[PDB]
Amino acid sequence: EDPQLLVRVRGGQLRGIRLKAPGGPVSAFLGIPFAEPPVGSRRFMPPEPKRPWSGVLDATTFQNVCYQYVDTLYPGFEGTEMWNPNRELSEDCLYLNVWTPYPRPASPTPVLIWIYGGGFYSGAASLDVYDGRFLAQVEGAVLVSMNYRVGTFGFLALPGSREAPGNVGLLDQRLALQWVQENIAAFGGDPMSVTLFGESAGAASVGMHILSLPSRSLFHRAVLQSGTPNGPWATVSAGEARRRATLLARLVGCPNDTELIACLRTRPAQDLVDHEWHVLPQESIFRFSFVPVVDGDFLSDTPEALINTGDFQDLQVLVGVVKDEGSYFLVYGVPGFSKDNESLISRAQFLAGVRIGVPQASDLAAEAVVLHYTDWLHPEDPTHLRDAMSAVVGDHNVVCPVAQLAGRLAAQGARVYAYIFEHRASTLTWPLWMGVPHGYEIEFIFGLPLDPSLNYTTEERIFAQRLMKYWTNFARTGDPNDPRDSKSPQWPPYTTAAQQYVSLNLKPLEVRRGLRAQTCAFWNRFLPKLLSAT
Amino acid sequence: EGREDPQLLVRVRGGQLRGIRLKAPGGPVSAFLGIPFAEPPVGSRRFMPPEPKRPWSGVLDATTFQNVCYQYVDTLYPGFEGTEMWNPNRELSEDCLYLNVWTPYPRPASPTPVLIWIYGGGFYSGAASLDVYDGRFLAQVEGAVLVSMNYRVGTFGFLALPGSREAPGNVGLLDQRLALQWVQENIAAFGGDPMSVTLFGESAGAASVGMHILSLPSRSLFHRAVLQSGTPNGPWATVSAGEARRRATLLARLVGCPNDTELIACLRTRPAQDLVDHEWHVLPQESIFRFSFVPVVDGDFLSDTPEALINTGDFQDLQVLVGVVKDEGSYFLVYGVPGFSKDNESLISRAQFLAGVRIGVPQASDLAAEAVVLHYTDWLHPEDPTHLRDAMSAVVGDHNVVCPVAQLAGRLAAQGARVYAYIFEHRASTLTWPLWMGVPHGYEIEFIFGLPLDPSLNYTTEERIFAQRLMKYWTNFARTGDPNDPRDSKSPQWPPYTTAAQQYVSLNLKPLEVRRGLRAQTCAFWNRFLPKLLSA
Numbered sequence A: 001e002d003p004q005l006l007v008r009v010r011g012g013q014l015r016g017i018r019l020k021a022p023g024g025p026v027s028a029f030l031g032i033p034f035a036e037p038p039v040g041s042r043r044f045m046p047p048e049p050k051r052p053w054s055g056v057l058d059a060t061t062f063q064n065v066c067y068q069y070v071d072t073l074y075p076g077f078e079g080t081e082m083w084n085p086n087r088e089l090s091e092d093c094l095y096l097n098v099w100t101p102y103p104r105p106a107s108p109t110p111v112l113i114w115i116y117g118g119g120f121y122s123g124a125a126s127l128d129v130y131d132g133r134f135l136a137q138v139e140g141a142v143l144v145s146m147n148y149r150v151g152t153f154g155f156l157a158l159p160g161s162r163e164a165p166g167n168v169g170l171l172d173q174r175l176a177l178q179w180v181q182e183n184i185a186a187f188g189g190d191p192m193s194v195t196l197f198g199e200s201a202g203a204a205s206v207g208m209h210i211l212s213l214p215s216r217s218l219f220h221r222a223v224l225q226s227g228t229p230n231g232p233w234a235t236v237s238a239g240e241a242r243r244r245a246t247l248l249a250r251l252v253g254c255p256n257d258t259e260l261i262a263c264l265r266t267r268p269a270q271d272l273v274d275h276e277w278h279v280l281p282q283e284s285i286f287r288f289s290f291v292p293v294v295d296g297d298f299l300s301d302t303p304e305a306l307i308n309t310g311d312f313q314d315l316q317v318l319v320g321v322v323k324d325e326g327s328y329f330l331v332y333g334v335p336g337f338s339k340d341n342e343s344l345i346s347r348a349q350f351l352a353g354v355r356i357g358v359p360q361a362s363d364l365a366a367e368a369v370v371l372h373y374t375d376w377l378h379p380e381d382p383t384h385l386r387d388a389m390s391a392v393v394g395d396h397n398v399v400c401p402v403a404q405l406a407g408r409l410a411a412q413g414a415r416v417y418a419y420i421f422e423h424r425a426s427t428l429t430w431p432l433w434m435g436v437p438h439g440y441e442i443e444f445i446f447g448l449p450l451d452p453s454l455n456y457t458t459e460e461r462i463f464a465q466r467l468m469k470y471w472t473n474f475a476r477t478g479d480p481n482d483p484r485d486s487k488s489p490q491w492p493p494y495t496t497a498a499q500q501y502v503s504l505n506l507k508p509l510e511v512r513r514g515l516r517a518q519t520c521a522f523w524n525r526f527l528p529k530l531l532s533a534t
Numbered sequence B: 001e002g003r004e005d006p007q008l009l010v011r012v013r014g015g016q017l018r019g020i021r022l023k024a025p026g027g028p029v030s031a032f033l034g035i036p037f038a039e040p041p042v043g044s045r046r047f048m049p050p051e052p053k054r055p056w057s058g059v060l061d062a063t064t065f066q067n068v069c070y071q072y073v074d075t076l077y078p079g080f081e082g083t084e085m086w087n088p089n090r091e092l093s094e095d096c097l098y099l100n101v102w103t104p105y106p107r108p109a110s111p112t113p114v115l116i117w118i119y120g121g122g123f124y125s126g127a128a129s130l131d132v133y134d135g136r137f138l139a140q141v142e143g144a145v146l147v148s149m150n151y152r153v154g155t156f157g158f159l160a161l162p163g164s165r166e167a168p169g170n171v172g173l174l175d176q177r178l179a180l181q182w183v184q185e186n187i188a189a190f191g192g193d194p195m196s197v198t199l200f201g202e203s204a205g206a207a208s209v210g211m212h213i214l215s216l217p218s219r220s221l222f223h224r225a226v227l228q229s230g231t232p233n234g235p236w237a238t239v240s241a242g243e244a245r246r247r248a249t250l251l252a253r254l255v256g257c258p259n260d261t262e263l264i265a266c267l268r269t270r271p272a273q274d275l276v277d278h279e280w281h282v283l284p285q286e287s288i289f290r291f292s293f294v295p296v297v298d299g300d301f302l303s304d305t306p307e308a309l310i311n312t313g314d315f316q317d318l319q320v321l322v323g324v325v326k327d328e329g330s331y332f333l334v335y336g337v338p339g340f341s342k343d344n345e346s347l348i349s350r351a352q353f354l355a356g357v358r359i360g361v362p363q364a365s366d367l368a369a370e371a372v373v374l375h376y377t378d379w380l381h382p383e384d385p386t387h388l389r390d391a392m393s394a395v396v397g398d399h400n401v402v403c404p405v406a407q408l409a410g411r412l413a414a415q416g417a418r419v420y421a422y423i424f425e426h427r428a429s430t431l432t433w434p435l436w437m438g439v440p441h442g443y444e445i446e447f448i449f450g451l452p453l454d455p456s457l458n459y460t461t462e463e464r465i466f467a468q469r470l471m472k473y474w475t476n477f478a479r480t481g482d483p484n485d486p487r488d489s490k491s492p493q494w495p496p497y498t499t500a501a502q503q504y505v506s507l508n509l510k511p512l513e514v515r516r517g518l519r520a521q522t523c524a525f526w527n528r529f530l531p532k533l534l535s536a
């Protein structure tokens, strides 16, 4: 029995495990329960706090992954398998993980809380890319990651009902945040310095905690990587959520809200997952069936309205995108695209891809998109059309929603830092035409290149170390700049006036101005005006 | 005769003419000025198609420029060369249908290619007698036979009651056509080759040239064409029959007139200056780069809109040279956009920009105007006065000239014509408009005509060499349908403009530079998206 691996939290005693990090040992407490299993009658319901347990709870292994769809598009392919569940699926999945330096910190250490992505229909805190040992060992950070319900289990809603109010997956995240306030000090973490960070849907989740008052007292800073609460995919109206839920009910033989939900609760988990994808209103990509709902409760109004009227004075935020946000999504539904060839497309294929990439666009709006993205000097060039299709999807879904968020937060009091990640991992298995795809900056932020057996170049290892420093400096001070270094170059705050952001790649920081300024004005100022009149 | 210069007496279909020997820097040239080509379109002939000039007896004196067609005279900036250079330089009169001929002295031995100039002035002004249209340099240095005609402008040349017999519309274009017929019949008498006639014009003159390309009866009167900063397609060069009727009857009301016959008959009783005095009161909105009486889509001279005709036309046996200047729109801003002036830097506010856009694109809906504003706004510095000023200029120049020219070059090329394109970027050292206006609309003309060759005009030595280069391109084009010098292979070649490569050249003090795409992205906005916005 090692006293460093023994901790006492409000629910009882835990025993962690000493793990090996390249530069030394770290203490890991994995699979800690933070809520009563949301099973049986608790399906679709808000999470309840975990009841106290007797004896010593074994916290040396990752717990089960929340029930979810498993990708089968490219069987055996690392590019896709790296995101698949790496533990048993089960609705009994509300557990969190804690990594800390070994021995446990002498003084209160700033805490980083990770919220994974996966379109709100997948993901797990146990994936290898979210391994917190590196950040814990090299920066002495206390890192926490929780599992939260996804898909129908976490977001199926019959707005106004008592049994399926919606947003329970976000409530799962919130309970884990509360658990950190109440118990993280026992691990040497400082509950007064909690930074949330997440990518994609995880970034959108972080944004929703920023916009939901009850969450605000649970953290102090936030990082949103390639995702936002505003935008076309992160939320749905109460009406559309009801529509998708009742349609799902119908598809599985069900059946008054109470009766419908009661019947949904009798169905095997895989039955719900089997019909999950048959409820989307149009043929599309970057659109997900069950996501956070504007309920007038967790989210008092649309994210769009909340970021326009909010006061973000005492908040520091780090936000950014990767160089090719949309490439990944094209192979999941756009005719002509495949990871196995160059994906050179025709102009006709391009106009068709646009209707799929911007599913909610009228014919006029779609034509505006085509005319804006077509390179009129080479309107029929396959390479340009392919890269344009990618850009359309990434701009519409991520880059412009991020530009929008950065601007409102900065205009309204927040301290904001922005970046564009442009380094393509030497070990990437997706083809070259996809560039730096959605999600591939994560392994660097978590410091995986520091593991010699992973085969990253020596420059990548130095790069990862730089990133871990930015992220942890940001967590510690609300500023990613190194207060030790006195010759950077400095990463300036993003402002509406100057719109400065930095490039994150192998070369030293480069300051740029305007995040797709012209193109995002198109998406954020003109298209709306188009549709609200037509 | 007997004692006069035997080299200045010539005979044309209507009679004998006596020209004048003029001095050009490098030698003498023959000039026959004020040759009548139509019966004076006065009294009962106002608003009517021109009739050929009846033969005269004796020797008609063709030694001085004739009257300028009745028109509005600009007084915005009294005494200012920038505006005065375009004002009438001879008496105003409805008796103005005369043309001019410049030829080498002595007259060419073999048939020489003919260049016919058609002046601009928004169809409401202009004259073939202005100093910038002086044909002596091209005649002397390139041995060209140059012809320029006066044609009716304003109400006199374009007021129309479509379908009527008395004011059919487009009579100013008919005056031009009559002069082209006069060249076919008589130019050989001056040593000109009727089988090699190139039309060139600028602005409304350019639009005029384009309309002759689109009107069959004019097609047999010329072989090649040059359109400088103007096109027959676009937002200002034509009006629909309904709009023309509307403007003509509103004008009639404004002067006390009112059945078309009675209305027109009453208009014919009004003093010419009364019509000019109300000419500007008939435009539908507050605007710039819009003119009251212009060519009308009559279903006769123009069988359909210029846009339809260039989309369906067969232009296989046609060579065309087309181009624009660096700052097509600047000039127009001081004539109606609040905040702009030739006497200050014209730095404007964002609010002044949004208002300028409503005036610069008068036919745009609220949604269309916002699209313009969002496209032209520099989102890194959305409030910068200098950028807003230059963006306002670009909006006007792109909408009215640059994009209509790109549209034209594209259709002509795709449909058989050989097209050459340019952008003129040299600002005359003698320009009197402020620097912020750059190379304004109309300021490439003095270079094409070779004025810098006159020592007394004070152009720099480089400008004189530059002028010579341009005269060479224009006359090579007139001679062969190709601006390139057949010999000199050293100088970079001017490639044809194609839909595939979209190549055009920069005309400035430096050697030719080939560029691709004429404001390609922005013109796609104007030529493909805005229209479609309109269909909704």
Ligand SMILES: CC[N+](C)(CC)CCC[n+]1c(-c2ccccc2)c2cc(N)ccc2c2ccc(N)cc21
Binding pocket: B277, B280, B281, B282, B283, B284, B285, B286, B287, B288, B335, B336
């Ligand atoms: C549109 C009708 N309007 C009578 C306003 C109700 C304004 C006409 C003013 N207006 C304009 C002008 C100014 C700004 C915008 C558009 C046109 C104008 C424009 C040019 N190049 C040359 C002369 C004039 C001009 C000459 C005589 C009279 N009498 C009025 C005139």
Ligand SMILES: *[C@@H]1O[C@H](CO[C@@H]2O[C@@H](C)[C@@H](O)[C@@H](O)[C@@H]2O)[C@@H](O)[C@H](O)[C@H]1NC(C)=O
Binding pocket: B338, B339, B340, B341, B343, B344, B345, B346, B347
């Ligand atoms: C530039 O001028 C515009 C027009 O005003 C006229 O010209 C100026 C120079 C004065 O002589 C004035 O009396 C004239 O009416 C102004 O509207 C504009 O504000 C001026 N720009 C600035 C701010 O200097």
Ligand SMILES: *[C@@H]1O[C@H](CO)[C@@H](O)[C@H](O)[C@H]1NC(C)=O
Binding pocket: A335, A336, A337, A338, A340, A341, A342, A343, A344
């Ligand atoms: C790439 O592969 C997909 C499916 O195998 C196919 O639809 C597409 O035509 C291919 N593209 C190329 C470059 O041939």
Ligand SMILES: *[C@@H]1O[C@H](CO)[C@@H](O)[C@H](O)[C@H]1NC(C)=O
Binding pocket: B456, B457, B458
């Ligand atoms: C040309 O320069 C001379 C000498 O400076 C000057 O007297 C004359 O007014 C100028 N004329 C022009 C064309 O500006």
